[PDB]
Amino acid sequence: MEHVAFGSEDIENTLAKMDDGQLDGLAFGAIQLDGDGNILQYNAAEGDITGRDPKQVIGKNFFKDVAPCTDSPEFYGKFKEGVASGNLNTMFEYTFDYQMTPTKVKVHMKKALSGDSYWVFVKRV
């Protein structure tokens, strides 16, 4: 297991070193998005949480295709405000409920160290 705590203030630095294999080692869900919301990486843990196969969702749009739950002012609206501003660091609870058992999660979105990408980190609550 890669030893990184959900919500760590320097998480973006830590994760900058990780390849997709090392990301699968994390104790929580992790998704990397571009500024348009397309999925760049998606880890083994998120898959546990949501049922989705990671390999298959890479390249799809998270807000339009993969995760309609999140197309709302409360989730997407926060994301897009962050991309436009060039800063984002927010943490909230949410329920995922598209084609799955409604599952309550804590979400943390943060801008990545890298140019124009963003992290969504997810854990059960």
Side-chain angles (χ1 to χ4, degrees), residues 58-72:
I58 303 312
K60 302 196 195 208
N61 190 274
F62 182 78
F63 300 107
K64 184 178 157 171
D65 309 309
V66 179
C69 318
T70 76
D71 186 0
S72 64

Side-chain angles (χ1 to χ4, degrees), residues 28-122:
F28 52 86
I31 307 158
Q32 197 185 27
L33 299 182
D34 71 11
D36 292 311
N38 304 302
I39 293 164
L40 307 173
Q41 35 219 42
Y42 191 101
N43 84 343
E46 186 70 2
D48 294 332
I49 291 166
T50 71
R52 276 52 176 191
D53 196 313
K55 249 52 163 134
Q56 308 198 198
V57 300
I58 303 312
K60 302 196 195 208
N61 190 274
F62 182 78
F63 300 107
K64 184 178 157 171
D65 309 309
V66 179
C69 318
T70 76
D71 186 0
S72 64
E74 294 218 48
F75 197 135
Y76 190 25
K78 298 180 191 170
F79 178 83
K80 70 96 160 175
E81 286 188 81
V83 179
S85 296
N87 96 289
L88 172 70
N89 185 355
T90 191
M91 195 184 296
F92 56 95
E93 294 178 4
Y94 212 76
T95 298
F96 294 151
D97 72 3
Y98 182 74
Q99 305 179 335
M100 68 202 281
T101 312
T103 299
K104 188 107 99 177
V105 298
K106 200 180 340 254
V107 178
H108 178 204
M109 284 190 299
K110 210 180 183 178
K111 182 179 156 75
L113 220 323
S114 108
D116 176 82
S117 67
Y118 303 79
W119 298 101
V120 186
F121 303 112
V122 181

